[PDB]
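User: I'm writing a short report section on ligand binding and want a predicted complex to refer to. Could you take this sequence and 316 and write out the structure as tokens? A short remark afterwards would be nice.
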Amino acid sequence: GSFVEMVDNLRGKSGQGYYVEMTVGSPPQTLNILVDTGSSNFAVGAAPHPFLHRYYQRQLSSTYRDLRKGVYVPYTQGKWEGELGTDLVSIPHGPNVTVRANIAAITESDKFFINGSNWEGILGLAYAEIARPDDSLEPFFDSLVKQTHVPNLFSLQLCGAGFPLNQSEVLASVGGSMIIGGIDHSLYTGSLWYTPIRREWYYEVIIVRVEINGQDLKMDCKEYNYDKSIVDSGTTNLRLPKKVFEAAVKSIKAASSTEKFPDGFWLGEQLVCWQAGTTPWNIFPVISLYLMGEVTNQSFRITILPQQYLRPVEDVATSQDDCYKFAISQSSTGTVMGAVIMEGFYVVFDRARKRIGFAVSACHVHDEFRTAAVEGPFVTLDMEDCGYNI
Ligand SMILES: CCCN(CCC)C(=O)c1cc(C)cc(C(=O)N[C@@H](Cc2cc(F)cc(F)c2)[C@H](O)[C@@H]2NCCN(Cc3ccccc3)C2=O)c1
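Assistant: Sure. The structure tokens for the complex follow:
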């Protein structure tokens, strides 16, 4: 690992998001910021909110610049309205650089901030094409690269604990690493495999094959990417296109049929619990996602375990049972490879080479019999046809 200053700079959990500490303004104002590869705006709470114990105070920053422009961002989950400006931004546990970046000062929000998440803002790491108001508002990472010598690349190691973290534990626990400008080898085992970034807007990728315990889900691969497939740290679940979700659930139910689970479980709404330590991991199937490789007619696969797609949750009775929620859900906006999927891997966002790399995470949760995996190569034909076109 050559980036020790950035290793272990993340806190949080899949259910409430992973955040990195940042400073805004002069003198610096410290804020915890949600790492979101699924959006492109840098925005921070800038007015009192019931879920915020701190916020950006523009009148206290000598370097604050008002853009005299409003901004609105509607996410899948919630939304916020704010005021645009720029100011000096740093990442304490990151590259030792200070950059002037666009900042949306959040003045109004609905279902955006999360009670107890400990974060007060969001760092949209995707491309300008999806930035609000429009693509002229330069994203933070673009500013970082244009203004410094930092390589146009970042990597994420999201670490799920494999068990419930209470309010105090999640504040003291290391949730992962965001390596800005590089790849730290201590964060993964084995080889890194790269899939093409199809288009620079979201971190869009193409899934060419899906397996549940080695069994081909056998759908037209275009279904897997309808209307797109993205890598998104800002979403908890693996979200799948309606038809793929239905087929995936049917297959996961069949593989786990030795035990019956209530419909509420499969809807990702109700928890299932087992006596401490008795979770029957082995009855649940591994899920393999084949991704287009960088070599013509070649793919590789990432394999996740139920330790990734079953999300640890505290029993409504706080008992000693090990409880979980099914972290795979239905999408109407394409595949979303959320945090529970990213927790199994070290993910490299190689903007410079327009590719996303995957390697087995040194912190993924597993058992003595199975491990997450990244394997290749596989002969795969007509992968370009798996991509969706409106
Ligand atoms: C329940 C609270 C949020 N959580 C738990 C903690 C992560 C989720 O798992 C979750 C679930 C859904 C169904 C949607 C989003 C969601 O909208 N995520 C977006 C970011 C986000 C994180 C939050 F913690 C709260 C929010 F309100 C929003 C992300 O950019 C997502 N990524 C894919 C594209 N879009 C839409 C979009 C399109 C263009 C530009 C910007 C955003 C998105 O919103 C997040």
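A remark for your report: The longest strand covers residues 98-110. The radius of gyration is 20 Å.
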